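Loading example: each entry is read as three labelled lines plus one structure line.
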Amino acid sequence: SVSIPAQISNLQTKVLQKLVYLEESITKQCT
Amino acid sequence: SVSIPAQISNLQTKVLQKLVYLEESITKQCT
Amino acid sequence: SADECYTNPSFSIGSSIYMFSQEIRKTDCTTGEILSIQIVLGRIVDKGQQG
């Protein structure tokens, strides 16, 4: 009820922001 | 308490480093 | 419980498992009665926290 939900939500946060950096990196590097 | 936490933490590790390789790949390939 | 005191901890880490022991004394914490001695066996794991 508490611990596992926390572990998964932390995973979601970390992955999504890494994907954000890639999106910006592509735009900046490939222009 | 033990097994599931291990499975998720292993997922996090593998995904994040794959994203790292992509970041380097973009920088090297697109320069 | 306010009349219970936890003292004389003993802690050791092996390869993946840890041993933990604590004494429960009555009130005094030093010379009081021993109500129980408790031993815990478990593992050190990654739960998505900072440590």
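Chain A is about 85% helix and 0% strand.
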